[PDB]
PDB file of all heavy atoms in Angstrom:
ATOM      1  N   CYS R 131      21.832 -16.143  -6.238  1.00  2.00           N
ATOM      2  CA  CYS R 131      21.858 -15.883  -7.754  1.00  2.00           C
ATOM      3  C   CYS R 131      22.451 -14.431  -8.032  1.00  2.00           C
ATOM      4  O   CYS R 131      22.701 -13.815  -7.060  1.00  2.00           O
ATOM      5  CB  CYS R 131      20.560 -16.075  -8.388  1.00  2.00           C
ATOM      6  SG  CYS R 131      19.341 -14.847  -8.140  1.00  2.00           S
ATOM      7  N   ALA R 132      22.537 -14.175  -9.315  1.00  4.19           N
ATOM      8  CA  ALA R 132      23.213 -12.867  -9.747  1.00  4.19           C
ATOM      9  C   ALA R 132      22.229 -11.626  -9.605  1.00  4.19           C
ATOM     10  O   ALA R 132      22.656 -10.563  -9.762  1.00  4.19           O
ATOM     11  CB  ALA R 132      23.729 -13.108 -11.184  1.00  4.19           C
ATOM     12  N   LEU R 133      20.984 -11.865  -9.274  1.00  6.30           N
ATOM     13  CA  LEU R 133      19.900 -10.814  -9.386  1.00  6.30           C
ATOM     14  C   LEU R 133      20.381  -9.567  -8.665  1.00  6.30           C
ATOM     15  O   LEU R 133      20.419  -8.540  -9.331  1.00  6.30           O
ATOM     16  CB  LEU R 133      18.575 -11.326  -8.836  1.00  6.30           C
ATOM     17  CG  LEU R 133      17.485 -10.283  -8.989  1.00  6.30           C
ATOM     18  CD1 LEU R 133      17.257  -9.934 -10.468  1.00  6.30           C
ATOM     19  CD2 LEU R 133      16.092 -10.744  -8.360  1.00  6.30           C
ATOM     20  N   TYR R 134      20.698  -9.651  -7.339  1.00  6.23           N
ATOM     21  CA  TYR R 134      20.855  -8.429  -6.462  1.00  6.23           C
ATOM     22  C   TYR R 134      22.260  -7.838  -6.757  1.00  6.23           C
ATOM     23  O   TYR R 134      22.568  -6.765  -6.262  1.00  6.23           O
ATOM     24  CB  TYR R 134      20.805  -8.913  -5.018  1.00  6.23           C
ATOM     25  CG  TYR R 134      19.515  -9.456  -4.521  1.00  6.23           C
ATOM     26  CD1 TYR R 134      19.639 -10.422  -3.392  1.00  6.23           C
ATOM     27  CD2 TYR R 134      18.249  -9.320  -5.101  1.00  6.23           C
ATOM     28  CE1 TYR R 134      18.507 -10.944  -2.894  1.00  6.23           C
ATOM     29  CE2 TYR R 134      17.161  -9.987  -4.580  1.00  6.23           C
ATOM     30  CZ  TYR R 134      17.295 -10.899  -3.470  1.00  6.23           C
ATOM     31  OH  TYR R 134      16.184 -11.483  -3.010  1.00  6.23           O
ATOM     32  N   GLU R 135      23.091  -8.455  -7.588  1.00  8.01           N
ATOM     33  CA  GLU R 135      24.445  -7.906  -7.952  1.00  8.01           C
ATOM     34  C   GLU R 135      24.208  -6.732  -8.981  1.00  8.01           C
ATOM     35  O   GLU R 135      25.319  -6.004  -9.250  1.00  8.01           O
ATOM     36  CB  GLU R 135      25.348  -8.957  -8.529  1.00  8.01           C
ATOM     37  CG  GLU R 135      25.568 -10.107  -7.540  1.00  8.01           C
ATOM     38  CD  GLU R 135      26.343 -11.233  -8.070  1.00  8.01           C
ATOM     39  OE1 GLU R 135      26.544 -11.396  -9.351  1.00  8.01           O
ATOM     40  OE2 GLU R 135      27.041 -11.868  -7.203  1.00  8.01           O
ATOM     41  N   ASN R 136      23.107  -6.579  -9.583  1.00  8.17           N
ATOM     42  CA  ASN R 136      22.750  -5.554 -10.578  1.00  8.17           C
ATOM     43  C   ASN R 136      22.326  -4.323 -10.010  1.00  8.17           C
ATOM     44  O   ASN R 136      21.254  -4.257  -9.334  1.00  8.17           O
ATOM     45  CB  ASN R 136      21.823  -6.105 -11.697  1.00  8.17           C
ATOM     46  CG  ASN R 136      22.323  -7.210 -12.443  1.00  8.17           C
ATOM     47  OD1 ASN R 136      22.851  -7.064 -13.612  1.00  8.17           O
ATOM     48  ND2 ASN R 136      22.383  -8.377 -11.851  1.00  8.17           N
ATOM     49  N   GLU R 137      23.047  -3.204 -10.179  1.00  7.39           N
ATOM     50  CA  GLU R 137      22.899  -1.870  -9.539  1.00  7.39           C
ATOM     51  C   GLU R 137      22.840  -0.869 -10.638  1.00  7.39           C
ATOM     52  O   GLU R 137      23.583  -0.974 -11.639  1.00  7.39           O
ATOM     53  CB  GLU R 137      24.014  -1.559  -8.658  1.00  7.39           C
ATOM     54  CG  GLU R 137      24.445  -2.685  -7.720  1.00  7.39           C
ATOM     55  CD  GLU R 137      25.474  -2.307  -6.633  1.00  7.39           C
ATOM     56  OE1 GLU R 137      26.169  -1.286  -6.836  1.00  7.39           O
ATOM     57  OE2 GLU R 137      25.440  -2.841  -5.557  1.00  7.39           O
ATOM     58  N   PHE R 138      21.905   0.066 -10.477  1.00 10.33           N
ATOM     59  CA  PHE R 138      21.522   1.057 -11.477  1.00 10.33           C
ATOM     60  C   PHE R 138      21.769   2.515 -10.929  1.00 10.33           C
ATOM     61  O   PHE R 138      21.029   2.777  -9.897  1.00 10.33           O
ATOM     62  CB  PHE R 138      20.107   0.762 -11.942  1.00 10.33           C
ATOM     63  CG  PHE R 138      19.980  -0.623 -12.468  1.00 10.33           C
ATOM     64  CD1 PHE R 138      19.688  -1.726 -11.696  1.00 10.33           C
ATOM     65  CD2 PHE R 138      20.286  -0.824 -13.836  1.00 10.33           C
ATOM     66  CE1 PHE R 138      19.641  -3.006 -12.207  1.00 10.33           C
ATOM     67  CE2 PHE R 138      20.273  -2.152 -14.360  1.00 10.33           C
ATOM     68  CZ  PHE R 138      19.934  -3.156 -13.526  1.00 10.33           C
ATOM     69  N   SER R 139      22.569   3.343 -11.553  1.00  7.79           N
ATOM     70  CA  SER R 139      22.885   4.680 -11.190  1.00  7.79           C
ATOM     71  C   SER R 139      22.298   5.633 -12.260  1.00  7.79           C
ATOM     72  O   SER R 139      22.703   5.433 -13.449  1.00  7.79           O
ATOM     73  CB  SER R 139      24.343   4.927 -10.863  1.00  7.79           C
ATOM     74  OG  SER R 139      24.730   4.058  -9.828  1.00  7.79           O
ATOM     75  N   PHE R 140      21.653   6.599 -11.858  1.00  6.27           N
ATOM     76  CA  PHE R 140      21.090   7.705 -12.747  1.00  6.27           C
ATOM     77  C   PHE R 140      21.831   9.018 -12.422  1.00  6.27           C
ATOM     78  O   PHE R 140      22.069   9.241 -11.316  1.00  6.27           O
ATOM     79  CB  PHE R 140      19.588   7.867 -12.629  1.00  6.27           C
ATOM     80  CG  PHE R 140      18.856   6.520 -12.999  1.00  6.27           C
ATOM     81  CD1 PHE R 140      18.526   5.555 -11.927  1.00  6.27           C
ATOM     82  CD2 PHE R 140      18.519   6.206 -14.223  1.00  6.27           C
ATOM     83  CE1 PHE R 140      17.935   4.403 -12.205  1.00  6.27           C
ATOM     84  CE2 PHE R 140      17.845   5.001 -14.519  1.00  6.27           C
ATOM     85  CZ  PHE R 140      17.541   4.151 -13.535  1.00  6.27           C
ATOM     86  N   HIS R 141      22.063   9.729 -13.559  1.00 11.43           N
ATOM     87  CA  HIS R 141      22.873  11.025 -13.423  1.00 11.43           C
ATOM     88  C   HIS R 141      22.517  11.863 -14.538  1.00 11.43           C
ATOM     89  O   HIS R 141      22.500  11.373 -15.684  1.00 11.43           O
ATOM     90  CB  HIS R 141      24.354  10.730 -13.133  1.00 11.43           C
ATOM     91  CG  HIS R 141      24.928   9.481 -13.810  1.00 11.43           C
ATOM     92  ND1 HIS R 141      25.449   9.566 -15.095  1.00 11.43           N
ATOM     93  CD2 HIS R 141      24.954   8.185 -13.526  1.00 11.43           C
ATOM     94  CE1 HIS R 141      25.759   8.364 -15.474  1.00 11.43           C
ATOM     95  NE2 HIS R 141      25.473   7.433 -14.499  1.00 11.43           N
ATOM     96  N   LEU R 142      22.390  13.199 -14.364  1.00 12.06           N
ATOM     97  CA  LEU R 142      21.927  14.128 -15.449  1.00 12.06           C
ATOM     98  C   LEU R 142      23.271  14.853 -15.938  1.00 12.06           C
ATOM     99  O   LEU R 142      23.158  16.084 -16.116  1.00 12.06           O
ATOM    100  CB  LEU R 142      20.889  14.959 -14.929  1.00 12.06           C
ATOM    101  CG  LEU R 142      19.598  14.232 -14.302  1.00 12.06           C
ATOM    102  CD1 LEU R 142      18.617  15.180 -13.717  1.00 12.06           C
ATOM    103  CD2 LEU R 142      19.064  13.363 -15.399  1.00 12.06           C
ATOM    104  N   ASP R 143      24.346  14.074 -16.167  1.00 11.25           N
ATOM    105  CA  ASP R 143      25.543  14.756 -16.598  1.00 11.25           C
ATOM    106  C   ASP R 143      25.613  14.717 -18.059  1.00 11.25           C
ATOM    107  O   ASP R 143      26.387  13.872 -18.634  1.00 11.25           O
ATOM    108  CB  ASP R 143      26.756  14.018 -16.025  1.00 11.25           C
ATOM    109  CG  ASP R 143      26.769  12.459 -16.261  1.00 11.25           C
ATOM    110  OD1 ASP R 143      25.752  11.869 -16.345  1.00 11.25           O
ATOM    111  OD2 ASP R 143      27.799  11.923 -16.219  1.00 11.25           O
ATOM    112  N   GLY R 144      24.975  15.729 -18.620  1.00 11.61           N
ATOM    113  CA  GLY R 144      24.893  16.044 -20.188  1.00 11.61           C
ATOM    114  C   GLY R 144      23.658  15.494 -20.828  1.00 11.61           C
ATOM    115  O   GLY R 144      23.321  15.864 -21.954  1.00 11.61           O
ATOM    116  N   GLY R 145      22.913  14.690 -20.042  1.00  9.21           N
ATOM    117  CA  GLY R 145      21.537  14.095 -20.551  1.00  9.21           C
ATOM    118  C   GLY R 145      20.996  13.140 -19.517  1.00  9.21           C
ATOM    119  O   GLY R 145      21.478  13.043 -18.398  1.00  9.21           O
ATOM    120  N   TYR R 146      20.054  12.296 -19.967  1.00 11.31           N
ATOM    121  CA  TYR R 146      19.388  11.307 -19.156  1.00 11.31           C
ATOM    122  C   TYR R 146      20.225  10.049 -19.126  1.00 11.31           C
ATOM    123  O   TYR R 146      20.005   9.121 -20.093  1.00 11.31           O
ATOM    124  CB  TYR R 146      17.971  11.072 -19.582  1.00 11.31           C
ATOM    125  CG  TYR R 146      17.001  12.231 -19.544  1.00 11.31           C
ATOM    126  CD1 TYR R 146      16.670  12.990 -20.720  1.00 11.31           C
ATOM    127  CD2 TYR R 146      16.497  12.578 -18.392  1.00 11.31           C
ATOM    128  CE1 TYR R 146      15.769  14.034 -20.653  1.00 11.31           C
ATOM    129  CE2 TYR R 146      15.618  13.762 -18.327  1.00 11.31           C
ATOM    130  CZ  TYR R 146      15.311  14.411 -19.420  1.00 11.31           C
ATOM    131  OH  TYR R 146      14.460  15.501 -19.357  1.00 11.31           O
ATOM    132  N   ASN R 147      21.229  10.000 -18.224  1.00 11.97           N
ATOM    133  CA  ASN R 147      22.290   9.001 -18.189  1.00 11.97           C
ATOM    134  C   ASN R 147      22.138   7.952 -17.148  1.00 11.97           C
ATOM    135  O   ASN R 147      21.545   8.320 -16.053  1.00 11.97           O
ATOM    136  CB  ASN R 147      23.674   9.785 -18.121  1.00 11.97           C
ATOM    137  CG  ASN R 147      24.063  10.479 -19.365  1.00 11.97           C
ATOM    138  OD1 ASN R 147      23.555  10.207 -20.361  1.00 11.97           O
ATOM    139  ND2 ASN R 147      24.762  11.537 -19.263  1.00 11.97           N
ATOM    140  N   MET R 148      22.356   6.634 -17.482  1.00 12.91           N
ATOM    141  CA  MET R 148      22.365   5.588 -16.521  1.00 12.91           C
ATOM    142  C   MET R 148      23.639   4.787 -16.622  1.00 12.91           C
ATOM    143  O   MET R 148      24.277   4.622 -17.712  1.00 12.91           O
ATOM    144  CB  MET R 148      21.189   4.656 -16.885  1.00 12.91           C
ATOM    145  CG  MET R 148      20.926   3.560 -15.695  1.00 12.91           C
ATOM    146  SD  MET R 148      19.649   2.370 -16.170  1.00 12.91           S
ATOM    147  CE  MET R 148      20.237   1.726 -17.683  1.00 12.91           C
ATOM    148  N   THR R 149      24.097   4.357 -15.352  1.00 14.65           N
ATOM    149  CA  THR R 149      25.203   3.430 -15.248  1.00 14.65           C
ATOM    150  C   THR R 149      24.774   2.076 -14.620  1.00 14.65           C
ATOM    151  O   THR R 149      24.186   2.121 -13.572  1.00 14.65           O
ATOM    152  CB  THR R 149      26.287   4.062 -14.334  1.00 14.65           C
ATOM    153  OG1 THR R 149      26.795   5.155 -15.085  1.00 14.65           O
ATOM    154  CG2 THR R 149      27.477   3.066 -14.074  1.00 14.65           C
ATOM    155  N   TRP R 150      24.883   1.023 -15.346  1.00 12.68           N
ATOM    156  CA  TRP R 150      24.520  -0.330 -14.922  1.00 12.68           C
ATOM    157  C   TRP R 150      25.766  -1.121 -14.506  1.00 12.68           C
ATOM    158  O   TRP R 150      26.651  -1.429 -15.394  1.00 12.68           O
ATOM    159  CB  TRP R 150      23.812  -0.997 -16.067  1.00 12.68           C
ATOM    160  CG  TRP R 150      23.391  -2.539 -15.800  1.00 12.68           C
ATOM    161  CD1 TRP R 150      23.388  -3.177 -14.625  1.00 12.68           C
ATOM    162  CD2 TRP R 150      22.699  -3.274 -16.796  1.00 12.68           C
ATOM    163  NE1 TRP R 150      22.788  -4.324 -14.793  1.00 12.68           N
ATOM    164  CE2 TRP R 150      22.442  -4.471 -16.189  1.00 12.68           C
ATOM    165  CE3 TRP R 150      22.404  -3.201 -18.131  1.00 12.68           C
ATOM    166  CZ2 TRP R 150      21.737  -5.530 -16.810  1.00 12.68           C
ATOM    167  CZ3 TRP R 150      21.877  -4.166 -18.750  1.00 12.68           C
ATOM    168  CH2 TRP R 150      21.529  -5.336 -18.138  1.00 12.68           C
TER     169      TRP R 150
END
Side-chain angles (χ1 to χ4, degrees):
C131 72
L133 184 60
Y134 307 152
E135 303 178 336
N136 292 259
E137 316 187 336
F138 299 91
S139 302
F140 300 92
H141 36 89
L142 303 178
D143 53 333
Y146 297 105
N147 291 334
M148 188 183 58
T149 293
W150 181 6

